[PDB]
Design a protein around this nucleic acid. Structure first.
Lengths: 107, 99, 93, 81, 79, 66, 93
DNA sequence: CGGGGGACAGCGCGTACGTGCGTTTAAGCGGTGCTAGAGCTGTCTACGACCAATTGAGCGGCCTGCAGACCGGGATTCTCCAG
DNA sequence: CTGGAGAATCCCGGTCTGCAGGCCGCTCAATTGGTCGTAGACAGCTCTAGCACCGCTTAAACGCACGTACGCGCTGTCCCCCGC
């Protein structure tokens, strides 16, 4: 029969075949289960969707049609769980959250 | 007939707002390149460089420095002060574990 | 020669969630690096799990356990749900 | 290549502090920052050169720098990955 | 059920003393209780995760060691 | 007792190797000692000899736990 | 069954440096744990390095580079010396 | 380089600490007793490695119109002060 | 309180341009299909340790009295960092 992509079989965008190949080549274990690469591709797709949605929200808030690294940093840092996840990650051209301490405010 | 100079500190707040908004680098590229090549000279001579390494080091350094400054500011505020003393930096790096 | 990435899949997901949103190359490469990083974290944790248990195979179960260990709270729960759903869908078909 | 650490001008240090949200700056700070930055740069560059030489190469690639930073627990995205 | 009150003030005092602290506010003890609770859940969650993936009903010290290792707090003296 | 009580929101009827509890106690005490020392440094930096909870909060904040 | 450790070799090394000093069991356990920790650190570093260069075999050169990367200064120099001399002796032997 | 305003030194205070004694408690210890579950074993079966043939998905190269950047100049806002 | 004044910033047309994104040919990695060996699934067994209980014993926590030093508030000085 005609080849049907495993990604389609699970209905995902991410390439499960490439995932399985990398898993086998990564020396993580001798043999790789059948369902693990699908699980991994689904998880990656889900997280990518989360961050991309937040970044798009931010970019629209800034009113631009393309997501730039600044939008990425804003989205990641504003989310508590994402910021926790990427607690040790540096983003090129990310800038910082515009936060100022209260005591330095003019009074 | 007055020079009309702003009070001490408002310019600082304005520039903080300016720089907490921008994302571009703050250091001149050429001096940074000179410094990094000089530093690398002592581990291996006649070392060539991809630029992408040059600006990657620049981003890493600037981000680390900004984080250190932010920690220093909190440390100084804990001292009920407004200006940072180098002792604040020392305490910050000590607490981080780098000392 | 030729290099592979996640670019097309990232673009597809972007069009899925925000169909009218562009993206710069730099941000796109950042996305790719992020994907690779998560891949390595999850894979290493799964491999350690397998070794700890004296197993020769990495299953979807180990992937789920590693996801639980590496993800915080709601992200972990939703990712677990997504992985389980995709697994059942793939297995049925 | 001598005395480039003074190439880090004081206005640059002000800009860095301001992006860090700092309002008032001592004058005895800048050299301290220079020393800390030099320590950091040495730490990263040593391992970067180690990676470059173990590949028996003569130029340092950014990818090496990424590895060095990862080894130091300071992960950077957007430079090849 | 208030085992969080099982950590008496004298114990916290001794702990600070080994930490080299001379004078202690009265508000400290509750803060310590909270922080310790946070730490305890953070470790125990992962420990139980390991114990479950091993299909077991008893948590082994080795599981705890793994949990500490993956949290960046390596422990020796237990295998 | 505290450890067992905490070990209920994740699963029920869990048994424990004693060594696991011992390791937990050791790690917790070491962590708390380190935090105490950092708090002491913070309080000294505030020209004080008595520790107050804001010192602990600043310490944990700088450590990145917060 | 039987569980292996490093107790005997550590005991021999102790008798080399301090031919009269005893040791408790707990210190033995700590020593074994430390040895294992170093082992996995260095081995993972070497494997990562090898994969970095797209190579199939981990040589002693990889261990040397990994030791340089993981050890600070004089410890690194001395350990490099020990590895080099031991390798040369074994190869000559 | 001028100057304001922040750092800092000094003083008063009152109270929240530390110190010590009497008291209550529960931790700890030794002992007994029970079994659930860890740990180990034999089996076999399903499942994953592996290989040959197939092919189209994705990667490389090309091209472009437009997002966004960059001007310029009014509009608007924020701050500082003399009243 | 409160207008002016000046400086700073925002904003809105108008212009230009590099690259985001799409199109294309190809090819190599994914797929398909079949083989085979073996990892672990699973059932079954043993007995260890973990859980529970109880009775002493006594160290440790607790409550409390008490008193003092320190954290804090306030004030004046001057110098040094900022606006230019």
């Amino acid at each position: 029969a005609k080849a049907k992509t495993r990604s389609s079989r699970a209905g995902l965008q991410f390439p499960v075949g490439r995932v399985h190949r990398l898993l086998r080549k990564g020396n993580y274990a001798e043999r790789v289960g059948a369902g693990a690469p699908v699980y991994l591709a689904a998880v990656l797709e889900y997280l990518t969707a989360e961050i991309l949605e937040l970044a798009g929200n931010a970019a629209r808030d800034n009113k631009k049609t393309r997501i730039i690294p600044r939008h990425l940093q804003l989205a990641v840092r504003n989310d508590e769980e994402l910021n926790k996840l990427l607690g040790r990650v540096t983003i090129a051209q990310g800038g910082v959250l515009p936060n100022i301490q209260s005591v330095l405010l003019p009074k | 007939k007055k020079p009309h100079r702003y009070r001490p500190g408002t310019v600082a707040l304005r520039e903080i707002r300016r720089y907490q908004k921008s994302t571009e680098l703050l250091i001149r590229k050429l001096p940074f390149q000179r410094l990094v090549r000089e530093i690398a000279q002592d581990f291996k001579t006649d070392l060539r460089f991809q630029s992408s390494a040059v600006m990657a080091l620049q981003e890493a350094s600037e981000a680390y420095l900004v984080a250190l400054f932010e920690d220093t500011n909190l440390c100084a505020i804990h001292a009920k002060r407004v200006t940072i003393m180098p002792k604040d930096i020392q305490l910050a790096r000590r607490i981080r574990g780098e000392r | 020669t030729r290099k592979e990435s996640y670019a097309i899949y990232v673009y597809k997901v972007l069009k899925q969630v925000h169909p009218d949103t562009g993206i710069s190359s730099k941000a796109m490469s950042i996305m790719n690096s992020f994907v690779n990083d998560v891949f390595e974290r999850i894979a290493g944790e799964a491999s350690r799990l397998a070794h700890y248990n004296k197993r020769s195979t990495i299953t979807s179960r180990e992937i789920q356990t590693a996801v639980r260990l590496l993800l915080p709270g709601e992200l972990a729960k939703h990712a677990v749900s997504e992985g389980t759903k995709a697994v059942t869908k793939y297995t049925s078909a | 290549l001598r005395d480039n650490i003074q190439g880090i001008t004081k206005p640059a240090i002000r800009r860095l502090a301001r992006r860090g949200g700092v309002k008032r700056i001592s004058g005895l700070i800048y050299e301290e920052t220079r020393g800390v930055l030099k320590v950091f740069l040495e730490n990263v560059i040593r391992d970067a050169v180690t990676y470059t030489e173990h590949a028996k190469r003569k130029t340092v690639t950014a990818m090496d720098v990424v590895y060095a930073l990862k080894r130091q627990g300071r992960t950077l995205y957007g430079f090849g990955g």
